[PDB]
């Protein structure tokens, strides 16, 4: 089971602090966190080369990430807002490889 996210489906009120947990098993260096326009293309929020280090992606604004261990990465959202409402996907990438999570469907109301 390559890459798994958690939770799969989430409905939260505008305000609350939401965290998205992603974890791997092929232990790839590179791990990524994604989001794409309602039925469009996937755009980079945040990525990571290795535990204890992230870099800003395309659309950094209004997210927090964290890599605490080679196989683990998380998307932090301090004060949510409906805007941030979408479908998130996690990947890991390495030695000619790229895996994806099953996506997290979120709702900011």
């Amino acid at each position: 089971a390559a890459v798994t996210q958690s939770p799969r489906n989430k409905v939260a009120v505008t305000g609350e602090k939401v965290t998205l947990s992603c974890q791997q098993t092929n232990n790839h260096n590179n791990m990524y966190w994604y989001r794409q326009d309602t039925g469009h293309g996937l755009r980079l929020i945040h990525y990571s080369y290795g535990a204890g280090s992230t870099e800003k992606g395309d659309i950094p604004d209004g997210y927090k990430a964290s890599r605490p261990s080679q196989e683990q990465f998380s998307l932090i959202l301090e004060s949510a807002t409906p805007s941030q409402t979408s479908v998130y996907f996690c990947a890991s990438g390495g030695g000619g490889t790229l895996y994806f999570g099953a996506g997290t469907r979120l709702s900011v109301l």
Partner: protein, 234 residues
């Protein structure tokens, strides 16, 4: 001594488009701490691997610390020492290829001292004052605690920063409320030296190379040495 820093001789937060979270990373309750152990291997003519295991998570079972040079390596090569340092991973190597992975391994610089007759009486801990200056004013002052009778500035520094993170937002995931800042030390004799706290003026931050400054394994005498931190608001 090391002369007091200069204005344009200090790094500016405003100049780092990077992510200040990779710096927060190395001091929010992150250090390696081992007690009474002995080197157990080695890579280049100046790094001693120990078999220290991640207590917090499960990242490493070994810890490669790199020292200023080869003779400083031997000074400790087979002695029973303690450890206190900030570890990293991205670019933690043991061979020639520069970006390669391992596991149970982690790197650092400095942070070790001979265990024998360097701890206290009955587990008592020593306290070290820290005067904080915001825009030249003694705003906040606290203290730090250690078990060494003579400890690695690194140990002490980390502990300082960890508090400032936990109570005065010294570093935040996107940046920092401060423009500049440096941690200066004073030795009973009159030796005074300082270390910049802010990243290099540019786009990215090599975690490692920052830390390489701790490879002088420089030590200080707890019971006497005094600390000063100096900041300037954005």
């Amino acid at each position: 001594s090391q002369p007091d820093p200069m204005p344009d001789d200090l790094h500016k937060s405003s100049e780092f488009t990077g992510t200040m979270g990779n710096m927060k990373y190395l001091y929010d309750d992150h250090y390696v701490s081992a007690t009474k152990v002995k080197s157990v291997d080695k890579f280049l003519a100046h790094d001693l691997i120990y078999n220290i295991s991640d207590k917090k998570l499960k990242n490493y079972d070994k810890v490669k610390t790199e020292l200023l040079n080869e003779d400083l390596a031997k000074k400790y090569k087979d002695e029973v020492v303690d450890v206190y340092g900030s570890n990293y991973y991205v670019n933690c190597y043991f061979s020639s290829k520069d970006n390669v992975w391992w596991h149970g391994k982690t790197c650092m610089y400095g942070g070790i001292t001979k265990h024998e007759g360097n701890h206290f009486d009955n587990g008592n801990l020593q306290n070290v004052l820290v005067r904080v200056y915001e825009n030249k004013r003694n705003t906040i002052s606290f203290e730090v605690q250690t078990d060494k009778k003579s400890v690695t500035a690194q140990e002490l520094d980390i502990k300082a920063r960890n508090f400032l993170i936990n109570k005065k937002n010294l570093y935040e995931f996107n940046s920092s409320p401060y423009e500049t800042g440096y941690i200066k030390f004073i030795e009973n004799n009159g030796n005074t030296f300082w270390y910049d706290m802010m990243p290099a003026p540019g786009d990215k931050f090599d975690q490692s190379k920052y830390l390489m400054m701790y490879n002088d394994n420089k030590t200080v005498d707890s019971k006497s040495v005094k600390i000063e931190v100096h900041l300037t608001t954005k």
